[model samples]
Target: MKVISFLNPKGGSGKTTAVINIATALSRSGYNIAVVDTDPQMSLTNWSKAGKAAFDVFTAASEKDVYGIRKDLADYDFAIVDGAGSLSVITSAAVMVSDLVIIPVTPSPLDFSAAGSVVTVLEAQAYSRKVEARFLITRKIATMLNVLKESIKDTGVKAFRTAITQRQVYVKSILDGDSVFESSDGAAKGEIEILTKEIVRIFE
Candidate 1:
């Protein structure tokens, strides 16, 4: 199975949301997916408990539990790990085990600064393992995407060509445990599909 983890040192960088959406998109595309929520917030776990997703959801609260949880998910085609917001032992372990680390950030100077630390962590870990990391801009302004793209480029990190624009549908989907595929919003669905395709391309 391909293990993809969403990580960032700063909170509210849209890590959890990105995990939920991407997993949802991939599952809908006929891939067997399992989500491991490593965040103490338990947002992903709770969402699973609420029966918001078609895929299975598990929790690995500590660094030690991460490997076991991953091993337990051997039957899955894809394992999406939703990591904690801080650079803790768990986050490091998550990066170490992941085939790809996705760092989601908003289009702002503050968010970019926080992502720099995450990039450093990913880079250091890369020396010992073959893990690819990429930046994904979330809650971005359509008009500011070019500027945001240029800003991330200056940081010497690779970024996704697709950026997730701010949309009320995302908030509603999380609240209702619904994926963009199930939403009435076409634009949101399109955005997620593009991002999901990029993920598949990378892993392919």
Candidate 2:
């Protein structure tokens, strides 16, 4: 199974939000998915429990214990891991085991600045892992696109060509325990389509 981790060393970068939404989208697309909630806050577990997602959810709080993940690998087509906002033995270990590391950030400079630290940690780690790293812009504004692009360019980090725009539906659907694609506006449908396709392309 392919392990895709949503991570950042900063809190409130929408890491949990990105985790659930992405996993919800992929699950709806018919992939057998497993979600591992590695945050002590249990944000992902609570959200999935509240959403009643029809998939497996695991809580892992240690790095050494993550090897148990191997047992569940064969049962799922993919795994989406929700990492803690702080770096730890478990979080670093997750990076080591992941097939792809997804760093989600807002368009603001502060969030982007934190992502640089995440990249630095990855660079220093020694592992047999090969993964594609990319940024997904969340809660972005059209007016700030140029500025956001420029700031990201300065960091030399490649971002997703497809972004999730600032929308009420993104928040509303999750609160009601539904995917955005299942909502009335269908706003998330297009975003999910592009995201899943990109993930598949990278996996291929």
Candidate 3:
């Protein structure tokens, strides 16, 4: 099974949102997927409890739970881990176990700086392990999206070509415990589908 982690040290980077949407899209597309919520906030766990999720959701509150939870869900095709807001034990454990680490960065100077710190940890872990890290620009508008992309180019980090534009539908879907695939917004669904495809290619 492929284990992917959505992580960023900074809050409001769209980390949990990306995990939910990507896992939902992959499940809807016929892949067997599961989610592990490591955040103490339990945002993903709460969402799964409230919604009719397509896949199973697990929780790992302690660093020790990370490997066991991942192994327990080994039968699944993919296991997506939603990390917490800080770089603590949970974040370290998640990074250690993930095959791919996806860091979401918003369109702002502070967000970019936060992403750099996340990248530093990810790069170190990736060098020691067989993990690949990718940066995803999230919650972006047209002008700032371009600016952020240009800014990321100078950092020399690999990024996804398909960005998640800022939209009310994303917030609504999360609040309603729904995925972009379940939303009527065609653009949101297409964007998520593109992202899913890219992630699947990486696993292959």
User: lDDT tens string, model 3, 79-147?
Assistant: 898978763766778888888888899987757887777666776786688578888989877576677
- Model 1 quality (TM-score): 0.93
lDDT of 2 by residue, 97-137 (tens): 77788888887765677777667656665345545677888
Backbone clashes, candidate 3: 0
The residue-by-residue lDDT of candidate 1 on 109-167, one tens digit each, is: 65677777767777798689858888998988744567768877886778998888888
lDDT of 1: 0.83
Local lDDT at 180 for model 1: 66
Question: Candidates sorted by TM-score, descending order?
Answer: 1, 3, 2
Model 2 off-target regions past 4 Å? Answer: 142-144
RMSD of each: 1.7, 2.2, 1.7
**Global lDDT of model 3:** 0.83
> Cα lDDT of all candidates, in order?
0.83, 0.74, 0.83
Better of 2 and 3 by TM-score: 3
lDDT value, residue 29 of candidate 3: 81
Q: Mind sharing the TM-score for model 3?
A: 0.92
